[PDB]
């Protein structure tokens, strides 16, 4: 009988991290994301832990349900305990609990998840594509005159940065409607580098920005973290230009070494921008729902 938990002891947390680590080693992709792992020590989400057969042992299944749209579930069954109905049981428990509204993330959209989705009568409703390109044979930026490029100068630039971010991402669930609070939270992370946030200004109002990211724990990789062009300055080549400039900067600072990004599969403009600069699909995360 699956018991929804709102909190976990230190041992239980260690048992879930062990299950996740064991699974990544076999599957080659982590089964739940980094934020799920940060939620293990908090009381903000709900969890299912499926214990093994004998006392004193490791767990064999885990599901996290994060509140919102519908809630989002991430789950994992140990490679050695698959094809025994555990994933199906935890998934049906989440659907019953959320009235059939929650979604499920499948990192890497691996064969088992696709089949399990099929078996549960779910369909893919979102695809988040991770694209990558090598740090070699990189593009050259074309800077149109009437535009000047420089890096972020601190809080002096925040008003414009939020204005542009919020105009470009207007109506976007998570990236739109930002405030100084979101900026401060990110500037507070160890990976932040003000010189990695590139800005293009008219020659002037901010026209667009490309926030790049190098994480200390993933050597040799750079990320196009947020790219946004004010709609008043879109369709003039700035988005590509900014992405190019960021690749140059990351390649200077830095499987194979590379620049990666995550983009919604139906974001036509961004996908085209990235395709023009040589990015290709590396992996896809599919959100499954009824």
Going by C-beta distance under 8 Å and a sequence separation of 6 or more, which residues neighbour residue 187?
194
Site for ligand ACO contains 93 (CB under 6 A): no
Q: Which of 24, 130, 234, 281 binds ligand ACO (CB under 6 A)?
A: 234
> Closer to ligand ACO at the Cβ: 157 or 210?
210
Site for ligand ACO contains 94 (CB under 6 A): no
269 annotated to bind ligand: yes
Closest Cα to residue 239, out of 279, 194, 196, 269? 269
CB 242 within 8 A of CB 212: no
Q: Using alpha carbons, list the distances in angstroms from residue 189 to 96, 213, 259.
A: 37, 11, 20
Residues of span 23-52 touching ligand ACO by CB under 6 A: 27, 31
- Torsion angle, CA of 174/269/156/178, rounded to 10 degrees? -10
By CB under 6 A, which span of 7-15, 93-101, 153-161, 228-236 interacts with ligand ACO? 228-236
Residues of span 160-189 touching ligand ACO by CB under 6 A: 168-169
Q: Which of 19, 36, 72, 113 binds ligand ACO (CB under 6 A)?
A: 113
Structure tokens at 120: 């549960």
Shortest distance (Å) from residue 289 CB to ligand ACO: 9
Residues of span 260-289 touching ligand ACO by CB under 6 A: 261-263, 267-270, 272-273, 276, 288
Helices (H) and strands (E) in the chain, counts: 8, 11
Shortest distance (Å) from residue 252 CB to ligand ACO: 20
Going by C-beta distance under 8 Å and a sequence separation of 6 or more, which residues neighbour residue 171?
none
Going by C-beta distance under 8 Å and a sequence separation of 6 or more, which residues neighbour residue 198?
149, 150, 151, 152, 209, 210, 211, 212, 242, 245, 246, 249
Q: Which of 16, 48, 59, 77 binds ligand ACO (CB under 6 A)?
A: 77
Q: How far apart are CA 15 and CA 198, in angstroms?
A: 41
Give the residue numbers of the binding site for acetyl-CoA: 75-77, 83-88, 227-229, 234-240, 267-272
Instruction: Name the site residues for ligand ACO (rule: CB under 6 A).
Output: 27, 31, 75-77, 82-88, 91, 104, 106, 110-113, 115-117, 119-120, 122, 168-169, 224, 226-229, 234-240, 261-263, 267-270, 272-273, 276, 288
Give the residue numbers of the binding site: 34, 75-77, 83-88, 174, 213, 223, 227-229, 234-240, 262, 267-272
């Amino acid at each position: 009988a699956l018991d929804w938990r709102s909190a976990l002891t230190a041992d239980e947390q260690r048992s879930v991290r062990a299950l996740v680590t064991a699974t990544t080693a076999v599957d080659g992709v982590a089964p739940v994301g980094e934020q799920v792992l940060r939620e293990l020590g908090q009381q903000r989400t709900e969890h299912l832990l499926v214990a093994g057969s004998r006392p004193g042992g490791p767990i064999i299944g885990y599901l996290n349900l994060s509140p919102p749209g519908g809630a989002m579930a991430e789950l994992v069954v140990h490679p050695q305990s698959r094809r025994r109905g555990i994933g199906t049981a935890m998934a049906r428990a989440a659907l019953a609990k959320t009235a059939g509204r929650n979604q499920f993330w499948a990192h890497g959209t691996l064969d088992p998840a696709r089949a399990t989705a099929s078996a549960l009568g779910l369909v893919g409703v979102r695809e988040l594509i991770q694209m990558r390109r090598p740090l070699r044979d990189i593009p050259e930026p074309t800077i149109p005159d009437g535009v000047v490029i420089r890096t972020y100068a601190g809080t002096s630039d925040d008003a414009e940065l939020l204005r542009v971010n919020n105009a470009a991402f207007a109506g976007h669930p998570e990236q739109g409607g930002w405030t100084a609070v979101q900026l401060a939270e990110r500037r507070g992370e160890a990976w932040f580098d003000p010189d990695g946030l590139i800005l293009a200004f008219g020659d002037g109002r901010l026209l667009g920005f490309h926030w790049t990211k190098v994480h200390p724990d993933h050597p040799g990789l750079g990320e196009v973290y947020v790219l946004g062009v004010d709609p008043a300055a879109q369709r003039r080549g700035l988005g590509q230009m900014l992405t190019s400039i960021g690749i140059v900067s990351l390649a200077r600072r830095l499987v194979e070494p590379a620049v990666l990004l995550y983009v919604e599969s139906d974001n036509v403009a961004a996908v085209r921008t990235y395709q023009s600069l040589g990015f290709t699909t590396y992996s896809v995360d599919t959100a499954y729902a009824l």
